[PDB]
Amino acid sequence: VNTALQEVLKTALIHDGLARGIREAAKALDKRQAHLCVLASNCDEPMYVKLVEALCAEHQINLIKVDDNKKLGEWVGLCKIDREGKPRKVVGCSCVVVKDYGKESQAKDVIEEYFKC
Amino acid sequence: KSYTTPKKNKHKRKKVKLAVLKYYKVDENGKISRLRRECPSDECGAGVFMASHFDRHYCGKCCLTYCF
């Protein structure tokens, strides 16, 4: 059901709601704007992954745990060179805190339904 | 052409890899221990942290100073 997360990712870039990056996450989590956060795994971030899980566990913050950093960078699309073909060289992002302003979408409802169960 | 005095260099930015972890302290449980002072300015609510220098505190963009 990750194609729904890709639709919410698109609506958060187009309306430009996602305040991505762990420094901007620390700001957005402290200023209480967050609804959904996506996070990579199985990388050399031993105490760092404990920090972001503790910040997400502070007050009313959701979690998506993908395993790859580079695939998360590919999804958000930070270095999409030659879209007509394959992207050349994209960076591996960790913590992207999305906040859809234009929530009128087919995807936000089914992800909220997943978080309700 | 040739000059007398040796050249002046530019200030190189002392860039830090993972500068976010230093600002907080992770607990054994799912809570936090916020080390550095939060900015009491109107522009930035409670998200922006102040500097922790050796003898006073400072915030960057609102440019607010507090001596002991």
Side-chain angles (χ1 to χ4, degrees):
Chain A
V1 295
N2 61 336
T3 56
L5 193 272
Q6 300 306 297
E7 184 173 347
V8 172
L9 188 280
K10 281 172 68 177
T11 55
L13 278 178
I14 289 168
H15 288 283
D16 192 52
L18 64 94
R20 66 95 46 76
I22 189 60
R23 193 76 268 272
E24 286 185 33
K27 298 290 162 65
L29 267 59
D30 286 10
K31 284 194 289 183
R32 299 170 178 276
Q33 299 293 310
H35 288 287
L36 191 273
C37 173
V38 63
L39 174 56
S41 200
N42 65 29
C43 298
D44 297 319
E45 289 177 325
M47 191 172 174
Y48 168 73
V49 70
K50 198 186 290 176
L51 264 298
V52 66
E53 284 289 336
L55 263 72
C56 294
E58 185 170 18
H59 188 275
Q60 197 184 351
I61 297 142
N62 299 329
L63 288 168
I64 299 296
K65 285 190 290 180
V66 79
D67 291 313
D68 205 65
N69 281 100
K70 191 178 287 183
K71 286 178 185 182
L72 194 143
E74 182 180 3
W75 289 346
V76 70
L78 281 177
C79 184
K80 295 182 293 188
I81 301 169
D82 190 47
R83 280 80 60 80
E84 296 174 0
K86 300 297 182 178
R88 294 294 88 192
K89 183 188 71 180
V90 74
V91 301
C93 176
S94 64
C95 315
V96 173
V97 175
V98 303
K99 190 265 180 180
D100 202 352
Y101 180 80
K103 289 180 282 186
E104 295 294 321
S105 186
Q106 298 182 356
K108 180 58 179 182
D109 297 312
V110 69
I111 296 169
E112 186 59 40
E113 188 171 15
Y114 177 75
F115 276 110
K116 196 266 180 290
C117 293
Chain B
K1 60 188 179 298
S2 57
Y3 285 159
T4 302
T5 304
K7 74 166 287 186
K8 187 173 285 183
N9 63 324
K10 194 63 62 177
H11 178 52
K12 192 64 178 179
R13 294 296 299 263
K14 196 64 63 63
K15 64 186 176 177
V16 175
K17 294 291 187 288
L18 290 82
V20 182
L21 192 140
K22 270 77 76 173
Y23 298 159
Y24 296 101
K25 278 296 297 177
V26 75
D27 209 66
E28 193 277 315
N29 302 314
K31 69 183 72 176
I32 42 84
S33 168
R34 292 170 180 180
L35 293 171
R36 292 184 179 76
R37 185 174 176 180
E38 293 184 339
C39 185
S41 189
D42 186 38
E43 287 289 331
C44 42
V48 171
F49 300 149
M50 296 186 70
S52 63
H53 290 265
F54 62 91
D55 61 340
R56 80 282 191 286
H57 295 94
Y58 184 67
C59 185
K61 58 167 164 296
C62 50
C63 188
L64 187 57
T65 317
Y66 281 98
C67 70
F68 302 167

